Design a protein around this ligand. Structure first.
Ligand SMILES: [Mg+2]
Ligand SMILES: [Mg+2]
Lengths: 204, 210, 222, 233, 226, 125, 196, 195, 196, 195
């Protein structure tokens, strides 16, 4: 009935020293029934990463919409969109559906190609921006992720340390949520290399 | 919640998951959904956890009184009907209970009774409750002439099948073997570790990567 | 219409060690967006080396604790001053709770103590008297923020041995009272940051063979 | 189950070094109609306790009679009724708290929020709250209704914690209460200018002040406020 | 949320707390609620957070275009008239509750606006879940002819009342001072009364703690030459 | 009433010329001189304030206009046509960019928008 | 809210309390409910603050554009414009407005516009939640062709009683005097009118 | 939904009852017997609310068995049907009525005639040549109206019953997992193994 | 309904209108709402006619049995019995009763019992639907220790206004005078009180 | 309720669809084909609200057939599935949404690989080895999780499908009157007569 908890799933983003991490579970369900264990919720437009939790049809629609808009941006601007600018575009796009919104919890992660500054942001379903220094959480286990992140997180973690922190934050949060899990992906993002790791976790 | 009870040559197999949820929140992964009424009788927890625990602990008390008064082990038929008659008194008051009453007596042999909050009492060879649905899971590899070791595995594998697909089933599998001389616990198996081992050894769950 | 129930917020945490148990709770009492008190104790010594908390609707919580304390007093009278074992206390509390099955005590109950073998024991109850013996249980507002952390840092879930690539689980070590209290304090500090109903103070009751002792720590008052 | 008809607004209170202060306005409201002005909502019990009551006035008058009956009953076969076996604030509270929770548990509440202010035998300050749900709590400052939202923040600036109580004089405590009553008169559409204030001091006993008025009010600035935005006259 | 505006001798001061909450959960512990409509016209928002940001940006944009068109510095009464006519049209469905303060050629101004499109004039105003706590302090300490230093003190004290006593408010105090014939000074995190204590333990994991199935390089670069 | 001119007033002549654009450029040629020079660390735009009368306050007539905080415009030709283009250029910097991306448009894209408005007046009815 | 307008010998006086509530909370204790739509045409506002402010703003616009083209509008014309907005949008408005004005030809005139958007010309009108308590008092004490001092006393005593019995009314008693002489604002503080 | 059919032929009464027990979308059993022997020449079939059906049937069985022992006599089917009706007529105005529908088939040894009684949960009773409870009545009745002859033999009645079940299996959305058929005649009550 | 009781120098006077309505229909236009529970203890009835008649009848019984055993009851005692019935049965009663009586020791006393079943002793009380319109008038015009003639005038003028503004009130103004001298019934017809 | 199953084996995609059409308690048809050929190597099966199912399926068929004629080219199954998803994603926020669930089975001639796409009425799309819509998914999925192997032959896939239908016929309360099975491979779309 509640659109934001039909399909389930989580995204978490964290900042480290000259790096950002964004991670998601792989579950898509119809409430109690698990349908797919290969539903990735993290997309990228150039060097800008977008995680989307919530109603799966809207996750797919918004991915297609932001690919569309960042493709036209690049052709006209003659450069890849930056995290700060994309954040404003996500906000703008969500608030134009103010009274018929997409049932999503988007998360932006990336490094500004010019300044080198790590950037993360989160949004409510109508585009209000949460620009936290530390971490952003979204999805059916957002309470669990807040709990994990608030204790596990410390600032200026090295990429390979940040990987362990965000991984343990996602895994243990997902294992306390019925509608999250069935596998997990972690992106470790540096200024000019991105590593993608699939985590081993319980499949119940 | 997934609870399974079936009759075979070697007695009764009882298999349950250990997951308790409040909404999307996983309250516990270590719930005991098999109630040890007495050393010869087992009950399964489904619907209300308190309703199942309270009235099946009460049933054990009533069963003990029966054995003192009549100097005979109570029949599964009689034990099941004490519980079914009690919940029927409370019908329409909001008791939530779907349970399998399992025992092995010389008089009856291996006997399973499904007892309901609605006042339903049914004797059957196999009963399964998966998250608000109950029925006589895979049903493809079940034959009366099955070994105790094989029957234990079938119950364990059956709970694994439900735990993977069903959001509200998981944690661990608890196994019980019910004989004429009483029941035997066949341990607690984490579904996480079980899934990977079953997948590797059976070849199954090809769709899942690990 | 008249609503006989309310929410007084608060978060409680029970952890069972090898030869000890802790029951911790925040000392903040709230209704809606107001603070009633910054220090209203929620965890109680009930005698016989048993500590209790009934978190949720504070009226139903006070009533249940009062009734259980009275149950201990009458157990002594009726059974020649026999010590009420934690398992016997747990079964007794189930009957107190299930007594009001059709007008429940709107509380999540945790009791902590030692079993008859002198090992740490925690028992967790639903509002209608369903109960289980557990090593770790958080209850109340910030329970969902605390339990995932405890799964990770107590049971070492999703933690493996470096260089085995997830083939060897991190082995379970017996936690000392000092290490448990660190995890309790960090759980409530984290909960205080992220939950508006959690703060003001933290009161921890520690149960050992020597008896019940009390530790208090300040939390942020915003 | 009922609904409150004739109602009393905020009761406010705080502990100071030597005792407790409690205050409440004299109004009995009939919805938006301010029907009754001479309603006393502070009811003293002996010389050591004052019970401040908000909510339904018919239920308050019932509770007033219970307390009057309690004093009579305590005096029966009690040679030390005016000494060691006199009613304590703690006894009077526990009784009311028992009644309130029993009445809510029969789904027929006393539609009130009650603060019991007093000083115990040993000279300890007593201040505890109970309401129509049987919910109880203690704090260095307590207030009901609007008082909880507007009085508590002001009173907590004087006594923010237990360690502030010995540092708070009766003059500072009374000042803070009287100011909080003025703020409630400004901002609570169910308040009256006229209020009663009771001080229970372990040395000077019970001082009950009737027919107090909110004074030193600021209104002059209103003359300079014109229109709701653009208007200049 | 706790938001206050205080008029003083030669200006107006606006203050706010820095906590944003999804139900009982604190989403952001250092949110900025003090918004710029124009360089010397600021406002603070309570209610739907998306609505207060959207409504100040729309009117802020239209105010800038109006300023350019008229060759005149924007007036607070213009921000107010444009906000109220927009909010009224949407009959409260845009859940924006704002305190609008600023200086212009006309002088110093302080207004409140509600989601349904009603507006109020005042020398001191409060808004949000913490407004009653804040208004208690304002009604206790406010006087005519406040100095800049007194008004900042009163404004931040009124927010503190909200931080401590309102569960909906917390963390830090943001302040903006708009004085006549001066640049508006935005004082982000003017007070920091709620810094988290050091934890008892470091939760930094040993490397290789997490079990990994697969690693791969992601191609973030465009299609390469040759 | 109704605008019954739903057809182009600028059309290709047999020689392939768009007359009305050529004549527009002739109007620009008659216009007062304005110039632009780009340095390493800035750009300068300049023009003459050709005052129609000495009684006129030439300060009140702005030939050099702020479009965004980082973009300025000067013109040669018909002043009134410039004034309305500055108004449209200022607005389109907000409606087609700042209200979407939360930042002012880059010079080339605002130019692109102004260029589009002028192209439309070359083909629209 | 307690609002009234009273016609006397020299013109008309508008009276109002200064209290605006959200439930039991006093959102504004120094509200100005006497609102100018023309130099010598004012109105008293009761109902939705958003609605009565929106209506008054539109009326002020309509009379400003009227004045540009046709010169100073009559109090009747101002009342007519109020009625048109109130009547045509009755489904979406909660507004009770008293319109008071001074002409030199007509002198002091009072028009009341209840919820339905009907118009009633009266020697005096009372409205708002607090008006219920003073129907008796006002009907016994109102005389036609009173002096300025008598009319100020009548409104002060009337709103004094309205404020006493109505929790929704309170604060200061604001008044606006409309005569040939011009526009005079009066304010009366609690310490004055409470002891009456 | 459950099928309970009865047909009264020349010398016996045949009862056909669906074997399926379904709660919501899951089938609990495929071998359920919705019948109770009240006395040696009286059989009762029942369909309705879970719990109520068996509780009511067993309560009637106990009462008729008690009367049998006390008087050392078998109550006539008419007498048994009147007793069952009155119990149902009591329950409708009770705090929580029994939602049970019954068919009573008995052989009257005094009259040497078979009798079929249809009683609904309200205590509405009729004596019919054939009867049914629920949606099954609609489908079956029109078929029995055509083929039924009062002098039919047991074998003819079984054939007509067999025709009814086949028709119901086709037209019914529900799978009722077949019927159990019992014959009530002078020799008593027996189950037809083949159907 | 408009009902009041006023204490003066020589005792107390009870006033009421004579109108009983079913919706807009006047079921009775000559109702007597002044009801005797003892020789010199009367009550004014507002609310459910069935409820206030049932309560008054039980009170009359209680005071008759009281008088048999303990002699003449105090006005306070009569009020107490009214309150007991109203308070204990608050869930099932719609009754607003004013109790007025004359003792020789206490003289004239007035008690009002609103819906909740609370008791308030007052120098005078007003109640009923029509009372809302005369709160202002009554509070401005009531003095303590008035003469009989002044108190009759005060009640006549008060209920006159209540009847004028309230559709639920109307008909004749009934009054009962309670003094040492005895019990006097007064009636005032529309042609008298309408022209006041 | 309706059964639509799909399994993607080594070299083909098999779709099994229930033949029953039921409105309320009456069965309107027992031979209904819940399938439309979108293109020569793409088949779509559908279950849902009456009218909407056929209207939606025929509308998609017309659009894919139009694209085929205009470009003289066959859209890839991925392309067809993305087009169908977008149409469903449009309809949820429309005045009256299409309540249709679809399975899209196609053989990709360029990639020489079979593909199965599951789309619900909201426009939720996934590519799976096997899929189902409704209550049937619950029963079937756990069976396919055990037996499914990615290198299965068409005959093995049919056997696994045959096993699923048998288990569905037993456990399901509803009678869905059997399934129609269609295979989609390199040679095109054919119906399995024997099942
Ligand atoms: Mg999980
Ligand atoms: Mg009348």
């Amino acid at each position: 009935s509640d659109p934001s908890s039909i399909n389930g799933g989580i995204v978490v983003a964290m900042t480290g020293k000259d790096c950002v991490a964004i991670a998601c579970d792989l579950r898509l369900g119809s409430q109690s029934l698990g349908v797919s264990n290969k539903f990735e919720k993290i997309f990228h437009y150039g060097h800008v990463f977008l995680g989307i939790t919530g109603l799966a049809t809207d996750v797919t629609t918004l991915n297609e919409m932001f690919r569309y808009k960042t493709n036209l941006y690049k052709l006209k601007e003659e450069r890849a969109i930056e995290p700060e600018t994309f954040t404003q575009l996500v906000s703008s796009s969500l608030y134009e559906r103010r009274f018929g919104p997409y049932f999503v919890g988007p998360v932006v992660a990336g490094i500004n190609s010019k300044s080198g500054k790590p950037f993360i942001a989160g949004f409510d379903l109508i585009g209000c921006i949460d620009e936290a220094k530390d971490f952003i959480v979204s999805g059916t286990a957002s309470d669990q992720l807040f709990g994990m992140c608030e204790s596990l997180y410390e600032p200026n973690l090295e990429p390979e340390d940040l990987f362990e922190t965000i991984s343990q934050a996602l895994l243990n949060a997902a294992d306390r949520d019925a509608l999250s899990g069935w596998g997990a992906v972690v992106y470790i993002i540096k200024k000019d290399e991105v590593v993608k790791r699939y985590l081993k976790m319980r499949q119940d | 919640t997934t609870t399974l009870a079936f009759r075979f040559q070697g007695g009764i197999i009882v298999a349950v998951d250990s997951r308790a949820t409040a909404g999307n929140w996983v309250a516990s992964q270590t719930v005991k959904k098999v109630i040890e009424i007495n050393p010869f009788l087992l009950g399964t927890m489904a619907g209300g956890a308190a309703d199942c625990q309270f009235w099946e602990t009460w049933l054990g008390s009533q069963c003990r009184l029966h054995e003192l008064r009549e100097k005979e082990r109570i029949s599964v038929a009689a034990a099941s009907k004490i519980l079914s008659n009690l919940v029927y008194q409370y019908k329409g008051a909001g008791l939530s209970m779907g349970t399998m009453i399992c025992g092995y007596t010389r008089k009856e042999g291996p006997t399973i009774y499904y007892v309901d909050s609605d006042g339903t009492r049914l004797k059957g060879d196999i009963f399964c409750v998966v998250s608000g649905q109950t029925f006589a899971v895979l049903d493809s590899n079940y034959k009366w002439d099955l070994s105790v070791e094989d029957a234990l595995y079938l119950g364990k594998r059956s709970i694994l099948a439900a735990a993977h697909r069903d959001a509200y089933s998981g944690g661990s599998v608890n196994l019980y073997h019910v004989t004429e001389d009483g029941w035997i616990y066949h341990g607690n198996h984490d579904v996480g570790e079980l899934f990977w081992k079953v997948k590797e050894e059976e070849g199954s769950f090809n769709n899942v990567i690990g | 219409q008249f609503n006989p129930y309310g929410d007084n917020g608060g978060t409680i945490l029970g952890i069972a060690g090898e030869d000890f148990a802790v029951l911790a709770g925040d000392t903040r009492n709230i209704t809606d967006y107001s603070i009633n008190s910054r220090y209203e104790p929620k965890v109680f010594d009930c005698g016989d080396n048993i500590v209790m908390s009934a978190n949720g609707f504070a009226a139903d919580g006070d009533a249940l604790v009062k009734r259980f304390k009275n149950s201990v007093k009458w157990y002594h009278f009726d059974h020649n001053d026999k010590k009420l074992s934690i398992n016997s206390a747990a079964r007794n509390i189930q009957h107190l709770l299930y007594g009001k099955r059709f007008f429940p005590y709107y509380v999540h109950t945790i009791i902590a103590g030692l079993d008859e073998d002198g090992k740490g024991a925690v028992y967790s109850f639903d509002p209608v008297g369903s109960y289980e013996r557990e090593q770790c249980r958080a209850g109340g507002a910030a329970a969902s923020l605390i339990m995932p952390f405890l799964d990770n840092q107590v049971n070492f879930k999703n933690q493996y041995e470096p260089g085995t690539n997830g083939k060897v689980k991190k082995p379970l070590k017996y936690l000392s009272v000092e290490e448990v209290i660190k995890l309790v304090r960090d759980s409530f500090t984290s909960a205080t940051e992220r939950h508006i109903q959690v703060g003001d103070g933290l009161e921890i009751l520690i149960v050992t063979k020597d008896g019940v002792r009390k530790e208090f720590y300040e939390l942020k008052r915003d | 189950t009922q609904q409150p008809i004739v109602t009393g607004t905020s009761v406010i209170s705080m502990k100071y070094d030597n005792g407790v202060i409690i205050a409440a306005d004299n109004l009995g409201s009939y919805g938006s109609l301010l029907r009754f002005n001479g309603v006393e909502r502070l009811i003293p019990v002996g010389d050591n306790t004052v019970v401040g009551i908000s909510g339904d006035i018919s239920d308050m008058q019932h509770i007033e009679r219970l307390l009057k009956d309690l004093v009579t009953e305590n005096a029966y076969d009690n040679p030390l009724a005016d000494a060691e076996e006199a009613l304590e604030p703690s006894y009077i509270f526990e009784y009311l708290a028992t009644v309130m929770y029993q009445r809510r548990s029969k789904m027929n509440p006393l539609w009130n929020a009650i603060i019991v202010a007093g000083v115990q035998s040993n000279g300890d300050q007593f201040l505890r709250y109970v309401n129509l749900l049987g919910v109880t709590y203690s704090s260095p400052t307590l207030a009901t209704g609007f008082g909880a939202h507007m009085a508590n923040p002001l009173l907590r600036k004087v006594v923010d914690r237990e360690s502030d109580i010995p540092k708070t004089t009766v003059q500072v405590a009374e000042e803070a209460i009287v100011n909080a009553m003025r703020v409630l008169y400004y901002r609570d559409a169910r308040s009256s200018r006229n209020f009663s204030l009771a001080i229970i001091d372990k040395n000077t006993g019970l001082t009950f002040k009737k027919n107090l008025q909110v004074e030193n009010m600021k209104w002059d600035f209103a003359k300079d406020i014109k229109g709701y935005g653009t208007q200049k006259i | 949320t706790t938001i206050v505006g205080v008029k003083f001798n030669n200006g107006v001061v606006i203050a706010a707390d820095t906590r944003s909450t999804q139900g009982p959960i604190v989403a952001d512990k250092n949110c900025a609620k003090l918004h710029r409509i124009s360089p010397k016209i600021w406002c603070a928002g309570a209610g739907t957070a998306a609505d207060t940001e959207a409504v100040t940006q729309l009117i802020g944009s239209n105010i800038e275009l109006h300023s350019l068109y008229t060759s005149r510095e924007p007036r607070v009464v213009s921000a107010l008239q444009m906000l109220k006519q927009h909010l009224f049209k949407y009959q409260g469905h845009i859940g924006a509750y704002l305190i609008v303060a600023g200086v212009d050629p006309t002088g110093s101004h302080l207004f409140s606006i509600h989601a349904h499109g009603s507006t109020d004039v005042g020398y001191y105003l409060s808004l949000g879940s913490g407004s009653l706590a804040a208004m208690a302090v304002l009604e206790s300490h406010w006087k005519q002819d406040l100095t800049k230093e007194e008004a900042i003190k009163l404004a931040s004290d009124a927010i503190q009342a909200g931080i401590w006593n309102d569960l909906g408010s917390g963390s830090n105090v943001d302040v903006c001072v708009m004085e006549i014939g001066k640049d508006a000074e935005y004082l982000r995190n003017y007070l920091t009364p709620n810094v988290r204590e050091e934890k008892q333990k470091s939760y930094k994991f040993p490397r290789g703690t997490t079990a990994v199935l697969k690693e791969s390089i992601v191609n973030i670069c465009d299609i390469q030459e040759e | 009433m109704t605008d019954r001119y739903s057809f182009s007033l600028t059309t290709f002549s047999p020689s392939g010329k768009l007359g009305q654009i050529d004549y527009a450029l002739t109007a620009v040629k008659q216009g007062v001189t304005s110039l632009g020079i780009k340095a390493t660390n800035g750009v300068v735009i300049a023009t003459e304030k050709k005052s129609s009368s000495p009684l006129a306050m030439s300060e009140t007539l702005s030939k050099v206009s702020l479009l965004t905080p980082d973009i300025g415009a000067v013109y040669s030709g018909m002043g009134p046509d410039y004034r309305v283009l500055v108004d449209k250029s200022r607005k389109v910097a907000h409606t087609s960019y700042k209200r979407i991306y939360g930042e002012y448009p880059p010079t080339k894209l605002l130019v692109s928008e102004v260029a589009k408005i002028m192209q439309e007046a070359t083909q629209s009815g | 809210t307690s609002i009234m307008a009273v016609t006397f010998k020299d013109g008309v006086i508008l009276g109002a309390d200064s209290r605006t509530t959200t439930g039991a909370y006093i959102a504004n204790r120094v509200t100005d409910k006497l609102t100018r739509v023309h130099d010598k045409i004012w109105c008293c506002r009761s109902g939705s603050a958003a609605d009565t402010q929106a209506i008054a703003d539109i009326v002020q616009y309509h009379l400003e554009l009227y004045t540009s083209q046709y010169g100073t509008p009559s109090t009747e014309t101002a009342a007519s414009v109020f009625k048109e907005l109130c009547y045509e949008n009755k489904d979406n408005l909660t507004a009770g407005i008293i319109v008071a004005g001074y002409d030199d030809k007509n002198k002091g005139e009072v028009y009341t516009i209840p919820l339905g958007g009907s118009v009633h010309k009266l020697p005096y009108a009372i409205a708002g939640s607090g008006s219920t308590f003073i129907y008796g008092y006002c009907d016994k004490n109102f005389r036609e062709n009173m002096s300025k001092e008598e009319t100020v006393d009548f409104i002060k005593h009337s709103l004094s009683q309205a404020i006493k019995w109505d929790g929704s009314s309170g604060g200061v008693i604001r008044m606006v005097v409309l005569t040939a002489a011009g526009v005079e604002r009066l304010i009366f503080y609690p310490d004055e009118y409470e002891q009456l | 939904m459950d099928i309970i059919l009865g047909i009264r032929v020349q010398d016996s009464v045949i009862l056909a009852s669906s074997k399926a027990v379904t709660r919501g979308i899951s089938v609990l059993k495929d071998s359920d017997d919705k019948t109770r022997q009240l006395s040696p020449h009286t059989l009762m079939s029942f369909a309705g609310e879970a719990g109520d059906t068996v509780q009511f049937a067993e309560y009637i069985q106990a009462n008729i068995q008690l009367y049998s022992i006390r008087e050392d006599y078998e109550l006539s089917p008419q007498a048994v049907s009147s007793f069952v009706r009155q119990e149902l007529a009591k329950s409708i105005r009770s705090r929580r009525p029994y939602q049970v529908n019954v068919l009573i088939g008995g052989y009257d040894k005094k009259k040497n005639k078979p009798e079929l009684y249809q009683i609904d949960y309200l205590g509405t009773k009729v004596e019919l040549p054939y009867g049914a409870h629920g949606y099954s009545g609609f489908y079956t009745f029109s078929l029995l109206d055509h083929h039924y002859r009062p002098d039919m033999t047991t074998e003819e009645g079984l054939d007509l019953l067999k025709l009814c079940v086949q028709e119901l299996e086709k037209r019914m959305p529900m799978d009722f997992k077949g019927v159990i058929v019992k014959i009530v005649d002078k020799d008593g009550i027996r189950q037809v193994d083949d159907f």
